[PDB]
Design a binder for this molecule. Structure first.
Ligand SMILES: [Ca+2]
Ligand SMILES: [Ca+2]
Ligand SMILES: [Ca+2]
Ligand SMILES: [Ca+2]
Length: 145
């Protein structure tokens, strides 16, 4: 939204628009992606351009780049908030919330649950059935429908 945000987003855009013509080609995108230690396929590059290319003209302009960037920033903010909450649940940092971690967290907060109840909570959220709650499960359990 801000003139300041748009200047910052114009700054990011320029790194992609290697020749300064106001558009990003699949090539340019590739150059940038390689310079970041990535080797995307030609098909991956086209997909990424296709996903941003609102007008379908084959390249991405700054207006299209602003739309994409403003969404990516809302997504990232959201991922960083859910993630900081997952790190709090996951005491020993192994990437999984256990029944004992969940119980301890509710209890330090105040709300005491039994092992029975905590096990039910883990089972509800444990999509892949590994007895624990990974990040993807934790995000889904905040959503479900
Ligand atoms: Ca260009
Ligand atoms: Ca376009
Ligand atoms: Ca853990
Ligand atoms: Ca699981």
């Amino acid at each position: 939204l801000t003139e300041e945000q748009i200047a910052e987003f114009k700054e990011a855009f320029s790194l992609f628009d290697k020749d300064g013509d106001g558009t990003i080609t699949t090539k340019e995108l590739g150059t940038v992606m390689r310079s970041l230690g990535q080797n995307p396929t030609e098909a991956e590059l086209q997909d990424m351009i296709n996903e941003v290319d609102a007008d379908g003209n084959g390249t991405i302009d700054f207006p299209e780049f602003l739309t994409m960037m403003a969404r990516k920033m809302k997504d990232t903010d959201s991922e960083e908030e859910i993630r900081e909450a997952f790190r709090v649940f996951d005491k020993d940092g192994n990437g999984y919330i256990s029944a004992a971690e969940l119980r301890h967290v509710m209890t330090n907060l105040g709300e005491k649950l039994t092992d029975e109840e905590v096990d039910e909570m883990i089972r509800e959220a444990d999509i892949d059935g590994d007895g624990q709650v990974n990040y993807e499960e934790f995000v889904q359990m905040m959503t479900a429908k």
